[PDB]
């Protein structure tokens with residue numbers, strides 16, 4: 001089997017991407033944030049504290065003839081941006097782009113933090129990291145990909161995120177029309193539960209490429225590109241007036257600037273992020289200071305190849321017996 005679903009930016013900045021997901025019988029369609037950096041499929045629901053729901057579509061398990069309470073199971077998660085959610089667990093039929101999993105754990109939120117409430121466009125998350133990170137207790141649950149894998153034509157999924165435009169998540173096949181050139185595959189460590197890999201270096205604009213190993217994770221659920229302070233300083237030094245602002249929380253730059261590109265290495269290959277992908281717009285409405293899309297990972301403890309980087313590539317998440325990651329230009 002295979003599946004194919006369109007993923008759409010939530011706003012004009014590409015702050016996140018949402019993909020429609022069918023849950024239950026009859027189908028209830030929710031728009032979920034597919035997150036290769038976490039491993040829980042959780043949704044706003046009829047159980048979510050009412051004051052914490054503000055425009056989201058909810059899953060109502062009592063209206064699904066295939067829903068079953070997973071008795072005694074609870075979940076609780078917190079993300080790198082400080083947000084969190086928790087609740088109880090059902091199993092139900094879940095379909096993505098025509099690919100169906102029966103008995104998928106659907107984690108129903110009883111509580112969500114303020115930034116979830118405030119994001120009316122995101123009805124929940126669909127985790128695509130390794131199932132060892134799943135938070136369900138006392139019986140840990142598998143991701144949608146893990147459950148689907150044996151039925152897929154090939155044990156892969158691909159992320160093809162758009163810049164200010166829709167894109168695609170495919171399961172079970174590689175669309176050879178969706179990229180240019182060849183796909184370069186690189187090793188993955190699953191020891192931390194992430195799609196963790198090592199980039200071979202970087203370049204700023206037209207500058208010479210610096211060969212240096214940068215360990216990090218491929219994370220569709222993180223908006224920006226978080227890299228070591230040395231790398232980030234070298235980038236922003238090329239932008240007149242850019243500076244790190246403690247009050248804003250990162251590098252800012254004049255909105256009047258045209259930004260240089262940023263290149264990252266994948267083995268001997270190179271992925272070029274155009275400068276415009278690095279502009280996240282005014283820090284506050286009407287400001288002429290703009291927020292940068294490349295930020296320091298110092299104090300995160302890991303480098304993160306988030307959407308800024310991934311949307312410059314066609315990315316293969318290869319879940320074969322030894323997982324790997326592939327990147328192609330597009």
Ligand SMILES: CNCc1ccc(Oc2cccnc2)o1
Nearest residue numbers: 033079080081083115116221222
């Ligand atoms: C804006 N915070 C709530 C929210 C929306 C989407 C996500 O999910 C995230 C956020 C950061 C990293 N990984 C997943 O959180």
